[PDB]
Amino acid sequence: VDLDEAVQRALEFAKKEGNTLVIVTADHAHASQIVAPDTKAPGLTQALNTKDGAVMVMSYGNSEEDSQEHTGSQLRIAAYGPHAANVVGLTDQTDLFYTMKAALGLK
């Protein structure tokens, strides 16, 4: 006859410990992330909507135009780096009507 232990406060205290706004934080993994990857367990501690990193690169010193110059590294105006001199020399007949160089091996 020790029911007073099981019911002591509520159960233990309430259950155990607390929080800023007490609910068990579940994810809601949809977002602007369209149905394309797997990512069945993303986790991710809240985050900020979808688009955030833009006016800062979080590297070198590139944000304000003061320190944006010289270290202008934030992927400003993009370009492909397939390796080698695109065609290289040997393409022979890839059978395309213009040399697409997204990716290239050998080096």
Annotation: binding site for Zn(2+)? 27-28, 70
Alpha helices in 1-101 (DSSP H): 3-6, 65-68
- Are 80 and 101 contacting, i.e. CB atoms less than 8 angstroms apart? yes
40 near another protein, rule: CB under 8 A: no
Of 61, 6, 54, 52, which is closest to residue 31 (Cα–Cα)?
A: 52
Q: Work out which of 6, 45, 50, 70 binds another protein, going by CB under 8 A.
A: 50
d(CA 72, CA 16): 51
Contacting another protein within 66-95 (CB under 8 A)? 71, 73, 75-83, 86, 90-92, 94-95
Q: Judged by CB, which is closer to another protein: 1, or 22?
A: 22
Q: Judged by CB, which is closer to another protein: 5, or 19?
A: 19
Question: What six digits make up the tokens of 64?
Answer: 């304000």
16 near another protein, rule: CB under 8 A: yes
Q: Work out which of 3, 36, 40, 45 binds another protein, going by CB under 8 A.
A: 36
